[PDB]
Design a protein around this ligand. Sequence first.
Ligand SMILES: O=C1CC=NC(C[C@H](NC(=O)OCC2c3ccccc3-c3ccccc32)C(=O)O)=N1
Length: 162
Amino acid sequence: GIREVILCKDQDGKIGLRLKSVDNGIFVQLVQANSPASLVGLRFGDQVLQINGENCAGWSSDKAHKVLKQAFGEKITMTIRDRPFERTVTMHKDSSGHVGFIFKSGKITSIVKDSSAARNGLLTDHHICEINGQNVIGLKDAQIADILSTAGTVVTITIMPA
Ligand SMILES: O=C1CC=NC(C[C@H](NC(=O)OCC2c3ccccc3-c3ccccc32)C(=O)O)=N1
């Protein structure tokens, strides 16, 4: 759904957030660790409907960057729609412990024939966002692989088109 967040700027008047224009909307592209943006729970793929009550519709990435930098006040408010491009696909590890996909730089690149990923219709050219709800955006591939490997039999992956 939609919600309001209220962020307090840090030491340098920053919130740790980079935004990106997509289809005449504005979306969260990068959230800094331990930042005000992380504190209020902003995540890669969240949609920003308003900043300080002003509609973001049609803003360029540069204009959103400017609005954030030049915002007057110690606080910045936003209206957020939670990751509208996100979907889950649930798969099951086979007897060798595999769900059946290859990924590189956090993006699914190949589906293994006659695997659980194949049976459940996992797609390529998609970001791996969460594994059973655990956020893996920005992790190294070996870290993603480790989280996958230690998951139980049910593996639900949250994905987003890349
Ligand atoms: O790109 C990555 C990197 C790390 N993890 C994953 C997810 C994992 N994929 C995977 O480990 O493939 C190699 C695996 C393997 C190793 C040795 C011999 C046979 C087979 C075999 C046969 C069928 C399907 C998968 C496999 C998974 O599908 O659970 N993808």
